[PDB]
Amino acid sequence: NYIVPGEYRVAEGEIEINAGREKTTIRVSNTGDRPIQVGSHIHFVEVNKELLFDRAEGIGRRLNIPSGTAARFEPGEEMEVELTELGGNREVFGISDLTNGSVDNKELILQRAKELGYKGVE
Amino acid sequence: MKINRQQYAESYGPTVGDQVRLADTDLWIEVEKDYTTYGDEANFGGGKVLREGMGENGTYTRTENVLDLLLTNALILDYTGIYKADIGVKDGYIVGIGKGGNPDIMDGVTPNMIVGTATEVIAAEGKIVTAGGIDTHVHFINPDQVDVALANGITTLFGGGTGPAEGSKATTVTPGPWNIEKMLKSTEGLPINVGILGKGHGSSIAPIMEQIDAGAAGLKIHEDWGATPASIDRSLTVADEADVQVAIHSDTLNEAGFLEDTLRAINGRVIHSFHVEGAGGGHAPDIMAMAGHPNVLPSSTNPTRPFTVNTIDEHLDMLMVCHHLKQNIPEDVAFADSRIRPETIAAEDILHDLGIISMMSTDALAMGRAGEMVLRTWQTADKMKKQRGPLAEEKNGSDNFRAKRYVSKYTINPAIAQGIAHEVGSIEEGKFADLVLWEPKFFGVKADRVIKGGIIAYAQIGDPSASIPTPQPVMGRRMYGTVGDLIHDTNITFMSKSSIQQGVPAKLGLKRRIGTVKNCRNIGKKDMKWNDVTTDIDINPETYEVKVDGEVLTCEPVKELPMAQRYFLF
Amino acid sequence: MKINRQQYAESYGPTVGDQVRLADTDLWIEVEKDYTTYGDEANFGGGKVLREGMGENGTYTRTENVLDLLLTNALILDYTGIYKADIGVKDGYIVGIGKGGNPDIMDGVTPNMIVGTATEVIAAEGKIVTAGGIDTHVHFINPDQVDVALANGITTLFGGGTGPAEGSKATTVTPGPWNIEKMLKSTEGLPINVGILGKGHGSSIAPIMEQIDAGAAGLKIHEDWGATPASIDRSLTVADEADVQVAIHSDTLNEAGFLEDTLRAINGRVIHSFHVEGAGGGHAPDIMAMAGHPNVLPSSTNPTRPFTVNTIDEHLDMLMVCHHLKQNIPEDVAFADSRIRPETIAAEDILHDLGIISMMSTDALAMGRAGEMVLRTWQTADKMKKQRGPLAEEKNGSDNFRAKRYVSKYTINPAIAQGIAHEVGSIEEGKFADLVLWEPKFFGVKADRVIKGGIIAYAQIGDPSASIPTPQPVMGRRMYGTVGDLIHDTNITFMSKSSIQQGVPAKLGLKRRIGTVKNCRNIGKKDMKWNDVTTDIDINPETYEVKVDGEVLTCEPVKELPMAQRYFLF
Amino acid sequence: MHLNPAEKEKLQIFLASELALKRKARGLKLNYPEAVAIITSFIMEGARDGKTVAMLMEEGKHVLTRDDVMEGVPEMIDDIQAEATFPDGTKLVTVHNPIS
Amino acid sequence: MHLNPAEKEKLQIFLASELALKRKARGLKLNYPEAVAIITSFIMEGARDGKTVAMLMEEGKHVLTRDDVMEGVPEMIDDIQAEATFPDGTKLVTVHNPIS
Amino acid sequence: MHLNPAEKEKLQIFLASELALKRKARGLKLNYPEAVAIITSFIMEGARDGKTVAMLMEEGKHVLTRDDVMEGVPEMIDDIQAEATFPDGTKLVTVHNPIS
Ligand code: NI
Ligand code: NI
Ligand code: NI
Ligand code: NI
Ligand SMILES: [O-]
Ligand SMILES: [O-]
């Protein structure tokens, strides 16, 4: 009974994030010479052009990491990340202007990604 | 992927089942429910969620379900519950309590809580958020009293006075049309919500009523103006016509009657009984019996709260010196001894705990402390837990029931009593965005940020010359909501329906938001949230012993309180 | 009769060829020219020249070429020159720079600088007079920040915020129509010129544009709201339509692109690059390469200015604690190390000296000091003189070239960037009379008197109870220009053309002078006075080495600065 | 520190008391504001020490005597009041006729 | 003197620190604002002495220990920040967990 | 106490002087505001002691010497002025070139 003012007594257990959504693991390479850090809620297909990965597998997805955290890629670094599915209406607007609509429009997203030089489009 | 609960609470504030200590008290509040979707929590900053195309929507204009302000991850403590939610504000009002963000990509977004281009963000993770305090016993004596109130989380002052005039130093009264008009004008410069009470004294209706038509929000009956059967009766006749509240400080001296005579004059009509314990004033020794009646809305003032080892010595001396009473005049000693009573002060602690006294208030600068209504509410709850134990209705080891009973006493209940709970007094959708953020370590002691009408008015913040706002000295300061013309939009002048219909605001050039006082005459004790108990209170005329349900109500004074010497520099 | 030069300078201030040390720096300014007629100098007091029938004209009404205010014998330091003149003010504007007095009896009187019955006098002999500082990176967090700015000679604050909300604590943003309206109202009570930036974030035009129509004067793109290609593009499309400036704090994380991606989104359009060195924010590690481009108006914020032995330790720790970064999380350490770089901070000193970074600013209360923009400008110039020598373009042993290059960085250049240089930013005929008098011993440290719209707003002055104004304690105090309704006429709210055309001032009840933002979209680096250099800046991604014209830009940090411990009590 | 308005104000009393005590130490008879400041600061420091209201009502009458103050000062001071945070929260102390 | 707003404000910190040091000298465990004031004033006086930011980050952790303050005060103070004029101009010092 | 505005303000001078004297006691050469504060407070305490205006004009020139202050401070201070309540009411003291 030492008193820490305002202290918490948290309950037992763990909090599962993004429960019930499909998860996907992919390899991603920072082919650039400057570091890239990617936040939890950016539409993954729209990240920095110099990140090389299968861009199709980023469509409709974001990093499966706690809200407000980020994954870091040092220059030249390749690592695996885990993605979860976007929710809500599953639409994206703005960011890199690759989607501007439903994430279901895969062919159109990839065509834009390819024309603008986002790495990893077939 | 899973996050352990300690880490989760550190990042986003506590979630369901987690408990938080209130300051350095023994009181624990438990999160009852959480509106979030785990993994889509809102947060703001570098690489955080509330960014364009992500948790911030880049499509919608302000009118299209977008907020002006989102408070993220608040732990709400309110009569309505103790729970985790985002709070959305628009046009100065609370418009949504739920989950904010971007429906493009997030699950569970409350449909009118879109974060858009128009949206400001306040991070409330790890804070407790309450409604602004509603103080209904304010003497307007010294304008420096406003910051004192804001610093302890008070956002509405109801009372009266013209500054340090003797009438105002004794009574919460702004008397007559002209003094009322002058103080409505003064109010334009006070960064807090205000309602003004007229003098509830007269034997003809017209002298009283003309105060209401001039812009008063209510009346005060005070013994120092003659708390006679006639003044009581005429004031309540006025109030019943005008739909405003009447507060009473009854005839301590029993000059024109005893308590039963005052109750007969009241005649079943609604009335707010101030400092009902009676040290602050009222029929000696039994005024506190008022608190058992169904037509009485009973409040305490704060210097008796709670009962401590210095209380009696402090009050006996204060009473003598302030009334110019002499220690060698037996009538003066007898009067003091009849008015300052350990028996009724001790019982007042327990009556609060039992929900028989519904409200707290200050009695600022007359016999109470402008900045200690919230402070002393929680010291009382803490003392009662230590002496009486967890209330029977508690579970999970939390003090949630007691915390909702006690937070009601200075938020929603005064607002209901005054006829202003349509605008203020609780964190509910559709009410004005008067919100207080508290660090739990300072809960009930020093507010972190006080939001008035959706803009920060007051904050504990540091050196204005620094690279960042947290370097010393950290002190209470007025923020932009108080500056220039924004003081008009962030605060409410509460006024009678008749004064508003008669165009008093336009006549005087008032630019503040105007609030209407209403629905004060067909409430009772049963309308006091969590504090609705009616009962026969017996006060023994010889011993001053208080009984409820045949049982004497007594407790001991304490030598030490929490929320005291750990916090204050003086 | 002849006067020796020492005596002359003591009586009337310095004249042609004379030099003056700036504070306790090694920087000397030389009087380039003098508008006086020797023997007919204006001066005021007992038996002095400005008396009726003598140097004061007794014939002419105010309208007939008579001044409201004459500043006698000023040493002007301005982008336009370093020279001696009388300064004449009328209707709150500078109307004449030349020679004031009475054409009845004096030679060389500038025809609209008659001293008449209507004319007030300020003695500026022995003072340096500059334009008021223009700070274009202000976070509105704490209203106490205004006096801090005035005390160091700042007269215009451009930026954003709603007080100590997290959005405002991170970003110079007042988001959306409602927050903008509220802060325009607040501004009515702030004794300084103000322009407000909206949120430069969105993927549709309308949510952004509606901020401009509501009364914003510009936009801020900030990474904390998502400094994405889309937000950049839409903001600049808005700006090009509305004729306002856009400021950017780019994507430090390189999340959606590297610097070249941000430049491609900009697409040759005009933009103001904030804290271009990058410690304050931006693409790691190479953001400072922005400063070489012809469409970029580059500013520094002040805590990196200039590079000292405590700079790196201070900034690394500040960054970690303010971002809740942990010393034991390698990603957090890597991020900090990528952002706080001695190589780019050292090079920033030299880029200022070379005229490649055009502007200074504060970053007040977010990562910069409200009252140190002017201070640190001159500490930088002083350090550069010590380390690099007199610039090649200097002569006579003076530092005039460097002084005009550096005074431009916080006067005329921010004003040009923001589209407000028609009103403020220099001592020229036809501009608003925002003037700062400095004792040379306090130059750039503590302003003597700050004139706003032709009335003193702020002064270092003593005991108000004394027989005279100079007894202790001498401290910074608000003067009559700040009091009552005069605060409206002495200060400017800068607003978009569209908000002015749509009647926003009348709608909100704004009584301040309204200034129009214009001519921001067809300027570039070439328009920055004395700081117009474009070049290829290379930043080595491995070593963070900065090269310009194939040469590494490096300098050492200093252990001591002038304008520091000699002056300040803390 | 999180100073509230009263804490800020009451620093002034301590400061005035320190000033007054310096003046007393170099042999000056104290004036009206000096005397009030010394006794007031004494009360607030006593509360901080954990004394009772009753103890401070007694002690405050013996902090300064007639011969510490100028002619007339004892009769100018009818009572001195201060509020401070005791272990049991804020309380009011009134010291009646502190200087006999 | 030409005091600016910050200089005026920061006099308050020194004053509170002096008050706190008096209280510590008569044997009181210090409270939250007392402790913050002592450590803050220490930082600003160190800058005036010409110490480095790095020196003050170290020293500020050893100005007060657990046994100088009331129960809970160490855990209430996560860090103390002050700006002061060093020989090389204003700098920010943050002292992390000053009281272990 | 019934403090008026000037009394409130002038407490600040005493406080700054105390701060400055502490700094001098630990061996620092004093800066411009420190020096002004010490000399100003000296004047006001002298008035309180009952010295004459003429005495204080003399004494104020010998409170600090060159070797007590930083380079340039003597030449920055042309004169220091203070008003204080002498036995014969408020008077103005000006000390010319206080530090030679
Ligand atoms: Ni009463
Ligand atoms: Ni009362
Ligand atoms: Ni920035
Ligand atoms: Ni900024
Ligand atoms: O009362
Ligand atoms: O910034």
Give keywords.
part of a larger assembly, 6 chains, B: 570 residues, alpha/beta, Urease, subunit C, domain 1, TIM Barrel, nine-stranded mixed beta sheet, nine-stranded parallel beta sheet, 16 helices, globular, D: 100 residues, Urease, subunit A, two-stranded antiparallel ribbon, 4 helices, 2 strands, Urease_gamma/gamma-beta_su (chains D, E, F), Urease_gamma_sf (chains D, E, F), Urease subunit gamma (chains D, E, F)
Structural class of chain A: mainly beta
Helix-strand string of chain D: HHHHEE
**Under CATH, the topology of chain A is which?**
Urease, subunit B
Evaluate the radius of gyration of chain D: 13 Å
Radius of gyration of chain A: 18 Å
PDB class: hydrolase
Keywords: urease, nickel, dimethyldithiocarbamate, enzyme
Entry title: The 1.68-A X-ray crystal structure of Sporosarcina pasteurii urease inhibited by thiram and bound to dimethylditiocarbamate
Chain A: Urease subunit beta
Description:
This is part of a larger assembly, with 1 copy of chain A (about 120 residues), 2 copies of chain B (about 575 residues) and 3 copies of chain D (about 100 residues). Chain A is mainly beta and about 120 residues long. Chain A contains 1 helix and 10 strands; from the N terminus they run E-E-E-E-E-E-E-E-E-E-H. In chain A, the strands form 3 sheets. Chain A has a 4-stranded antiparallel β-sheet, with no helix packed on it. A two-stranded antiparallel sheet of chain A has the order 4-7. In chain A, a hairpin with an 8-residue loop joins strand 9 and strand 10. The longest helix of chain A is centred in the C-terminal third of the chain and has 11 residues, at about 105-115. Chain B folds into 2 domains: about 1-130 and about 425-485, Urease, subunit C, domain 1; about 130-425 and about 485-570, TIM Barrel. Chain B has 16 helices and 24 strands. In chain B, the strands form 4 sheets. In chain B, strands 4, 5, 6, 7, 8, 16, 17, 18 and 19 form a 9-stranded mixed β-sheet that branches. The radius of gyration of chain B is 24 Å and the shape is globular. By secondary structure, chain D is of the alpha+beta class. Helices cover about 50% and strands about 15% of the residues of chain D. Chain D has 4 helices and 2 strands; from the N terminus they run H-H-H-H-E-E. In chain D, strands 1-2 form a two-stranded antiparallel sheet. In chain D, helix 1 packs across helix 2 (about 30-50). The longest helix of chain D is centred in the N-terminal third of the chain and has 21 residues, at about 5-25. Chains in contact: A-B, A-C, A-E, B-C, B-D, B-E, C-E, C-F, D-E, D-F, E-F. The interface between B and C is large, with 56 and 68 residues. The structure holds nickel (II) ion (4 copies) and hydroxide ion (2 copies).
